[PDB]
Amino acid sequence: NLHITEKLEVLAKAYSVQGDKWRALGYAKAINALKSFHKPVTSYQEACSIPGIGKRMAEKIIEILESGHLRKLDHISESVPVLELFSNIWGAGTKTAQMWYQQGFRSLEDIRSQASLTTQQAIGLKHYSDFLERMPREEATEIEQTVQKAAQAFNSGLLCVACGSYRRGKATCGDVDVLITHPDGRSHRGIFSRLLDSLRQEGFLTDDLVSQEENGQQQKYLGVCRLPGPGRRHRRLDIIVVPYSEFACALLYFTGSAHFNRSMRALAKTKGMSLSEHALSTAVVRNTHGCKVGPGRVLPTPTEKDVFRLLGLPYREPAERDW
DNA sequence: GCCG
DNA sequence: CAGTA
DNA sequence: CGGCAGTTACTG
Ligand SMILES: Cc1cn([C@H]2C[C@H](O)[C@@H](COP(=O)(O)OP(=O)(O)OP(=O)(O)O)O2)c(=O)[nH]c1=O
Ligand SMILES: [Mg+2]
Ligand code: NA
Ligand code: NA
Ligand code: NA
């Protein structure tokens, strides 16, 4: 509900690509609140009443109804669409997009022929369209299975779980998030080397984006893969290997959504605790600015439910975390 | 941008 | 580190 | 005034 959002969503992306992350966050929250309410908004007071919507935002919602158009939109820089185009290249963010624009680049052809690309950005440009597409969850299953098969091939005890949007039950997935760990709490160490080389053997992996294979403590692998046969597109792969003791927090984190994690972490903070993909801690010592000064104590969290419990929150199935 |  | 994830 | 997730994990 509420298509007075699609117009704010435009301003949100504009601010975001331009690097004004906080203002963009504000819009994201407001847009989210509107899309989450039960009835069409038709009153200034009805807008301010909504948490996440202030005078400024409501003031704009008023015009969206009293005018049917937002004057602010007719003043967005012409650079925005190009910044969005550029920042949609994997490995390039607002800073790079703005730099390229300042240098006169206006299209991907300009980037391809004149820009100095990092290894990651070159891969992103090579798969520009594929990286903007989502795959049916069915294909995500095959990819997760492909990774699990290669993993359990050298250690049948390894536990592999597809997380992210997949575990949240979404019909399509941006990429495939696979969490790998081992019940014995030690057999997870230094497996990337073997797993990745195995996946490379069968020609499954096509490009590596983030993979510190010289570090025996590598925690993640971000890359590209493709299943065999016709009609197959290059798909993004995200693999993390975590120690069993961090299984719950890691599973919770990797399942998301990102907004859900942020909300949960923000809550933990208001309660003198801290939550991360590594652990839930209590008695955390923070400064006047909120930065974690003291480590506090790690709380035992053998399951996701324990995390919710310790935070005094009712448990939520992955599908109920799709924020 | 919103909010404490 | 800044940038991007 | 000043936080808005994580003292998150790589890259160069
Ligand atoms: C991007 C991002 C992800 N995460 C966590 C929660 C996400 O579910 C998980 C994996 O990230 P993503 O794969 O980016 O998210 P997603 O799988 O939910 O959505 P998509 O289908 O587009 O891939 O990592 C964060 O905590 N913060 C972030 O900023
Ligand atoms: Mg994903
Ligand atoms: Na990008
Ligand atoms: Na590498
Ligand atoms: Na991912």
Side-chain angles (χ1 to χ4, degrees), chain A residues 1-2 5-6 8-12 14-34 36 40-41 44 46-54 56-61 63 65 68 70 72-73 75-125 127-148 150-185 187-188 190-192 194-284 286-290 292 294-323:
Chain A
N1 189 2
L2 279 163
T5 54
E6 57 178 51
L8 291 177
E9 184 59 54
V10 173
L11 267 172
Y15 282 122
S16 182
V17 300
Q18 288 173 124
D20 195 342
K21 65 167 299 179
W22 299 137
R23 185 179 296 297
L25 180 51
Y27 274 77
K29 311 291 269 288
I31 294 178
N32 188 303
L34 299 171
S36 291
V41 183
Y44 176 70
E46 179 178 51
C48 304
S49 64
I50 308 178
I53 295 72
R56 304 287 296 303
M57 199 63 74
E59 182 169 353
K60 293 182 181 61
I61 296 179
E63 179 183 0
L65 302 178
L70 181 54
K72 189 57 169 297
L73 297 181
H75 286 299
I76 298 177
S77 180
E78 49 180 47
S79 65
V80 174
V82 177
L83 297 181
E84 177 177 1
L85 179 74
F86 291 169
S87 71
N88 270 339
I89 293 175
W90 205 101
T94 178
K95 294 299 183 175
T96 302
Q98 299 186 73
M99 179 190 83
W100 285 332
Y101 190 91
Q102 185 288 312
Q103 306 182 330
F105 294 87
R106 294 288 181 280
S107 73
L108 295 187
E109 177 49 37
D110 286 347
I111 295 304
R112 181 198 72 65
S113 64
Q114 295 162 279
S116 183
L117 307 173
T118 61
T119 303
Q120 304 173 331
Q121 298 164 345
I123 293 172
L125 181 55
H127 302 294
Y128 194 83
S129 292
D130 281 336
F131 284 10
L132 288 172
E133 270 187 287
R134 302 179 64 72
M135 72 189 95
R137 63 175 297 110
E138 291 55 53
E139 171 163 37
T141 295
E142 306 181 71
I143 293 170
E144 185 287 328
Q145 283 294 84
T146 301
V147 177
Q148 187 187 306
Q152 308 184 313
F154 57 96
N155 197 303
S156 60
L158 293 170
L159 177 52
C160 300
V161 190
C163 305
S165 61
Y166 181 86
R167 184 161 181 259
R168 293 206 305 290
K170 305 303 291 182
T172 63
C173 309
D175 67 347
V176 185
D177 301 299
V178 189
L179 182 168
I180 298 174
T181 186
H182 197 303
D184 67 26
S187 298
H188 61 287
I191 61 178
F192 268 121
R194 287 176 295 182
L195 176 56
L196 304 182
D197 289 319
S198 175
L199 292 174
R200 285 163 178 148
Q201 186 66 57
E202 59 177 304
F204 180 65
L205 298 184
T206 59
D207 308 84
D208 308 321
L209 286 166
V210 168
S211 185
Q212 196 166 58
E213 292 168 60
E214 62 278 358
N215 178 353
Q217 304 293 291
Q218 183 181 346
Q219 291 183 57
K220 81 176 69 190
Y221 166 83
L222 302 185
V224 186
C225 68
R226 186 169 68 175
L227 297 172
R232 293 296 188 179
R233 307 305 306 176
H234 285 82
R235 304 302 188 185
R236 289 183 297 122
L237 179 54
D238 182 347
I239 299 170
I240 67 178
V241 176
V242 301
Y244 200 56
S245 55
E246 288 176 29
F247 188 37
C249 289
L251 179 59
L252 178 74
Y253 153 70
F254 219 24
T255 292
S257 70
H259 279 299
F260 177 75
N261 289 341
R262 294 175 74 168
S263 294
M264 253 191 93
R265 300 181 176 200
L267 178 66
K269 188 167 190 176
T270 66
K271 301 183 172 186
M273 302 169 79
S274 67
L275 171 70
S276 77
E277 39 268 58
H278 286 302
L280 174 63
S281 300
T282 185
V284 173
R286 295 195 173 80
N287 54 53
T288 305
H289 308 308
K292 177 188 288 185
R297 302 194 302 289
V298 175
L299 292 171
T301 59
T303 72
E304 281 181 334
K305 287 184 172 184
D306 290 297
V307 180
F308 283 79
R309 180 171 55 72
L310 293 167
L311 287 174
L313 297 174
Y315 177 75
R316 308 185 69 135
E317 292 297 321
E320 309 174 67
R321 310 173 200 178
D322 198 28
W323 295 15

PDB file of all heavy atoms in Angstrom, chain A residues 84-94 121, chain C residues 4-5, ligand 3:
ATOM      1  N   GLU A  84      23.872   6.277 -10.387  1.00  0.00           N
ATOM      2  CA  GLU A  84      23.198   5.023 -10.090  1.00  0.00           C
ATOM      3  C   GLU A  84      23.739   3.951 -11.028  1.00  0.00           C
ATOM      4  O   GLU A  84      24.018   2.834 -10.607  1.00  0.00           O
ATOM      5  CB  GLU A  84      21.685   5.178 -10.274  1.00  0.00           C
ATOM      6  CG  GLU A  84      20.888   3.903 -10.058  1.00  0.00           C
ATOM      7  CD  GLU A  84      19.385   4.123 -10.188  1.00  0.00           C
ATOM      8  OE1 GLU A  84      18.963   5.270 -10.459  1.00  0.00           O
ATOM      9  OE2 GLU A  84      18.624   3.152 -10.017  1.00  0.00           O
ATOM     10  N   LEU A  85      23.896   4.304 -12.300  1.00  0.00           N
ATOM     11  CA  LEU A  85      24.421   3.367 -13.290  1.00  0.00           C
ATOM     12  C   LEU A  85      25.807   2.885 -12.870  1.00  0.00           C
ATOM     13  O   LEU A  85      26.086   1.680 -12.852  1.00  0.00           O
ATOM     14  CB  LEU A  85      24.519   4.041 -14.660  1.00  0.00           C
ATOM     15  CG  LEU A  85      25.073   3.229 -15.837  1.00  0.00           C
ATOM     16  CD1 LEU A  85      24.042   2.214 -16.317  1.00  0.00           C
ATOM     17  CD2 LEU A  85      25.437   4.183 -16.968  1.00  0.00           C
ATOM     18  N   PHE A  86      26.668   3.843 -12.535  1.00  0.00           N
ATOM     19  CA  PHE A  86      28.033   3.556 -12.123  1.00  0.00           C
ATOM     20  C   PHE A  86      28.092   2.797 -10.799  1.00  0.00           C
ATOM     21  O   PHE A  86      28.813   1.803 -10.685  1.00  0.00           O
ATOM     22  CB  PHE A  86      28.837   4.861 -11.986  1.00  0.00           C
ATOM     23  CG  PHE A  86      29.109   5.565 -13.292  1.00  0.00           C
ATOM     24  CD1 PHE A  86      29.628   6.857 -13.293  1.00  0.00           C
ATOM     25  CD2 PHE A  86      28.849   4.947 -14.515  1.00  0.00           C
ATOM     26  CE1 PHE A  86      29.880   7.523 -14.489  1.00  0.00           C
ATOM     27  CE2 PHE A  86      29.097   5.602 -15.712  1.00  0.00           C
ATOM     28  CZ  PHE A  86      29.614   6.892 -15.704  1.00  0.00           C
ATOM     29  N   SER A  87      27.340   3.250  -9.798  1.00  0.00           N
ATOM     30  CA  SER A  87      27.386   2.570  -8.509  1.00  0.00           C
ATOM     31  C   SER A  87      26.709   1.200  -8.524  1.00  0.00           C
ATOM     32  O   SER A  87      26.690   0.512  -7.516  1.00  0.00           O
ATOM     33  CB  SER A  87      26.808   3.451  -7.390  1.00  0.00           C
ATOM     34  OG  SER A  87      25.405   3.591  -7.478  1.00  0.00           O
ATOM     35  N   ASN A  88      26.153   0.797  -9.659  1.00  0.00           N
ATOM     36  CA  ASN A  88      25.548  -0.521  -9.731  1.00  0.00           C
ATOM     37  C   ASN A  88      26.582  -1.527 -10.241  1.00  0.00           C
ATOM     38  O   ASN A  88      26.288  -2.706 -10.426  1.00  0.00           O
ATOM     39  CB  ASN A  88      24.296  -0.517 -10.617  1.00  0.00           C
ATOM     40  CG  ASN A  88      23.027  -0.218  -9.826  1.00  0.00           C
ATOM     41  OD1 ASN A  88      22.989  -0.398  -8.606  1.00  0.00           O
ATOM     42  ND2 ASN A  88      21.982   0.222 -10.516  1.00  0.00           N
ATOM     43  N   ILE A  89      27.799  -1.050 -10.475  1.00  0.00           N
ATOM     44  CA  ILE A  89      28.889  -1.925 -10.895  1.00  0.00           C
ATOM     45  C   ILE A  89      29.430  -2.496  -9.579  1.00  0.00           C
ATOM     46  O   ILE A  89      29.778  -1.730  -8.687  1.00  0.00           O
ATOM     47  CB  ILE A  89      30.033  -1.133 -11.577  1.00  0.00           C
ATOM     48  CG1 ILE A  89      29.563  -0.548 -12.913  1.00  0.00           C
ATOM     49  CG2 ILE A  89      31.243  -2.042 -11.770  1.00  0.00           C
ATOM     50  CD1 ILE A  89      30.602   0.343 -13.589  1.00  0.00           C
ATOM     51  N   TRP A  90      29.503  -3.819  -9.447  1.00  0.00           N
ATOM     52  CA  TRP A  90      30.012  -4.423  -8.205  1.00  0.00           C
ATOM     53  C   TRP A  90      31.423  -3.906  -7.911  1.00  0.00           C
ATOM     54  O   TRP A  90      32.308  -3.999  -8.761  1.00  0.00           O
ATOM     55  CB  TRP A  90      30.073  -5.954  -8.331  1.00  0.00           C
ATOM     56  CG  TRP A  90      29.994  -6.691  -7.015  1.00  0.00           C
ATOM     57  CD1 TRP A  90      28.893  -7.310  -6.489  1.00  0.00           C
ATOM     58  CD2 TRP A  90      31.045  -6.860  -6.049  1.00  0.00           C
ATOM     59  NE1 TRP A  90      29.192  -7.851  -5.260  1.00  0.00           N
ATOM     60  CE2 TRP A  90      30.505  -7.590  -4.964  1.00  0.00           C
ATOM     61  CE3 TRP A  90      32.389  -6.462  -5.993  1.00  0.00           C
ATOM     62  CZ2 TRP A  90      31.263  -7.935  -3.835  1.00  0.00           C
ATOM     63  CZ3 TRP A  90      33.145  -6.806  -4.864  1.00  0.00           C
ATOM     64  CH2 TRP A  90      32.576  -7.534  -3.805  1.00  0.00           C
ATOM     65  N   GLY A  91      31.634  -3.368  -6.710  1.00  0.00           N
ATOM     66  CA  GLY A  91      32.955  -2.874  -6.352  1.00  0.00           C
ATOM     67  C   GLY A  91      33.081  -1.365  -6.468  1.00  0.00           C
ATOM     68  O   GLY A  91      34.105  -0.786  -6.098  1.00  0.00           O
ATOM     69  N   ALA A  92      32.046  -0.723  -6.994  1.00  0.00           N
ATOM     70  CA  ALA A  92      32.062   0.731  -7.123  1.00  0.00           C
ATOM     71  C   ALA A  92      30.939   1.305  -6.271  1.00  0.00           C
ATOM     72  O   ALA A  92      29.796   0.878  -6.380  1.00  0.00           O
ATOM     73  CB  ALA A  92      31.873   1.147  -8.588  1.00  0.00           C
ATOM     74  N   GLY A  93      31.260   2.269  -5.420  1.00  0.00           N
ATOM     75  CA  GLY A  93      30.232   2.867  -4.587  1.00  0.00           C
ATOM     76  C   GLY A  93      30.026   4.316  -4.969  1.00  0.00           C
ATOM     77  O   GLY A  93      30.407   4.740  -6.066  1.00  0.00           O
ATOM     78  N   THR A  94      29.442   5.087  -4.062  1.00  0.00           N
ATOM     79  CA  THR A  94      29.188   6.493  -4.329  1.00  0.00           C
ATOM     80  C   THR A  94      30.456   7.297  -4.617  1.00  0.00           C
ATOM     81  O   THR A  94      30.466   8.138  -5.514  1.00  0.00           O
ATOM     82  CB  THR A  94      28.436   7.153  -3.154  1.00  0.00           C
ATOM     83  OG1 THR A  94      28.246   8.545  -3.437  1.00  0.00           O
ATOM     84  CG2 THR A  94      29.231   7.017  -1.863  1.00  0.00           C
ATOM     85  N   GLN A 121      35.845  -4.466  -9.878  1.00  0.00           N
ATOM     86  CA  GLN A 121      34.990  -3.674 -10.752  1.00  0.00           C
ATOM     87  C   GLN A 121      34.996  -4.207 -12.177  1.00  0.00           C
ATOM     88  O   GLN A 121      33.980  -4.151 -12.862  1.00  0.00           O
ATOM     89  CB  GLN A 121      35.424  -2.207 -10.715  1.00  0.00           C
ATOM     90  CG  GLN A 121      35.292  -1.582  -9.331  1.00  0.00           C
ATOM     91  CD  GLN A 121      36.071  -0.281  -9.198  1.00  0.00           C
ATOM     92  OE1 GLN A 121      36.925   0.033 -10.031  1.00  0.00           O
ATOM     93  NE2 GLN A 121      35.796   0.470  -8.136  1.00  0.00           N
TER      94      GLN A 121
ATOM     95  P    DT C   4      33.158   3.690  -3.000  1.00  0.00           P
ATOM     96  OP1  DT C   4      33.157   3.805  -4.479  1.00  0.00           O
ATOM     97  OP2  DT C   4      32.261   4.564  -2.204  1.00  0.00           O
ATOM     98  O5'  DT C   4      32.875   2.167  -2.618  1.00  0.00           O
ATOM     99  C5'  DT C   4      33.651   1.117  -3.196  1.00  0.00           C
ATOM    100  C4'  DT C   4      33.270  -0.215  -2.594  1.00  0.00           C
ATOM    101  O4'  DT C   4      33.773  -0.285  -1.245  1.00  0.00           O
ATOM    102  C3'  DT C   4      31.762  -0.474  -2.493  1.00  0.00           C
ATOM    103  O3'  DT C   4      31.376  -1.464  -3.451  1.00  0.00           O
ATOM    104  C2'  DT C   4      31.555  -0.990  -1.074  1.00  0.00           C
ATOM    105  C1'  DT C   4      32.968  -1.206  -0.541  1.00  0.00           C
ATOM    106  N1   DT C   4      33.127  -0.936   0.904  1.00  0.00           N
ATOM    107  C2   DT C   4      33.611  -1.948   1.712  1.00  0.00           C
ATOM    108  O2   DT C   4      33.924  -3.048   1.288  1.00  0.00           O
ATOM    109  N3   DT C   4      33.714  -1.621   3.042  1.00  0.00           N
ATOM    110  C4   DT C   4      33.384  -0.419   3.635  1.00  0.00           C
ATOM    111  O4   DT C   4      33.518  -0.279   4.848  1.00  0.00           O
ATOM    112  C5   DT C   4      32.887   0.602   2.730  1.00  0.00           C
ATOM    113  C7   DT C   4      32.508   1.939   3.285  1.00  0.00           C
ATOM    114  C6   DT C   4      32.788   0.296   1.427  1.00  0.00           C
ATOM    115  P    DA C   5      29.851  -1.951  -3.521  1.00  0.00           P
ATOM    116  OP1  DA C   5      29.629  -2.441  -4.902  1.00  0.00           O
ATOM    117  OP2  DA C   5      28.986  -0.871  -2.972  1.00  0.00           O
ATOM    118  O5'  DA C   5      29.807  -3.207  -2.544  1.00  0.00           O
ATOM    119  C5'  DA C   5      30.642  -4.339  -2.783  1.00  0.00           C
ATOM    120  C4'  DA C   5      30.750  -5.192  -1.539  1.00  0.00           C
ATOM    121  O4'  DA C   5      31.414  -4.467  -0.482  1.00  0.00           O
ATOM    122  C3'  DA C   5      29.430  -5.620  -0.909  1.00  0.00           C
ATOM    123  O3'  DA C   5      28.888  -6.772  -1.561  1.00  0.00           O
ATOM    124  C2'  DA C   5      29.857  -5.979   0.503  1.00  0.00           C
ATOM    125  C1'  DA C   5      31.088  -5.099   0.751  1.00  0.00           C
ATOM    126  N9   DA C   5      30.868  -4.062   1.759  1.00  0.00           N
ATOM    127  C8   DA C   5      30.498  -2.753   1.591  1.00  0.00           C
ATOM    128  N7   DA C   5      30.390  -2.087   2.715  1.00  0.00           N
ATOM    129  C5   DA C   5      30.709  -3.022   3.688  1.00  0.00           C
ATOM    130  C6   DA C   5      30.785  -2.944   5.089  1.00  0.00           C
ATOM    131  N6   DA C   5      30.558  -1.827   5.784  1.00  0.00           N
ATOM    132  N1   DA C   5      31.115  -4.066   5.763  1.00  0.00           N
ATOM    133  C2   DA C   5      31.365  -5.182   5.067  1.00  0.00           C
ATOM    134  N3   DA C   5      31.339  -5.377   3.751  1.00  0.00           N
ATOM    135  C4   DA C   5      30.999  -4.243   3.113  1.00  0.00           C
TER     136       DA C   5
HETATM  137 NA    NA E   3      28.400  -1.113  -6.600  1.00  0.00          NA
END
